[PDB]
Amino acid sequence: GYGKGYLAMFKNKKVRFKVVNSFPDLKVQFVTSFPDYKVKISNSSSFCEETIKIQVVTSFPDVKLQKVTSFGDFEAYID
Numbered sequence: 001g002y003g004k005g006y007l008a009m010f011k012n013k014k015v016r017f018k019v020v021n022s023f024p025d026l027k028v029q030f031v032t033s034f035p036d037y038k039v040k041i042s043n044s045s046s047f048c049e050e051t052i053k054i055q056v057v058t059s060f061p062d063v064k065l066q067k068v069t070s071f072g073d074f075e076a077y078i079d
Contacts, residue, residue, distance in 0.1 A: 001025045004063050014075040016048040024055035027062045035066035037073040045077045
């Protein structure tokens with residue numbers, strides 16, 4: 001699927017994370033320290049540039065994301 005650098009394209013933008021169990025665009029591990037990107041989780045599905053299918057994993061992710069309430073690298077609405 002996509003690589004670690006893909007999300008760099010959405011700096012200061014919002015995407016949609018679609019949770020899947022098979023064939024993800026990105027395997028995503030959520031961490032509380034040392035992420036690859038900081039992401040703000042939005043409650044509104046509006047203004048999402050794009051839909052990215054993500055599989056939540058606990059080991060060997062494509063990317064590590066840290067949920068932040070402020071100063072994210074991008075925003076994501078999860079569905």
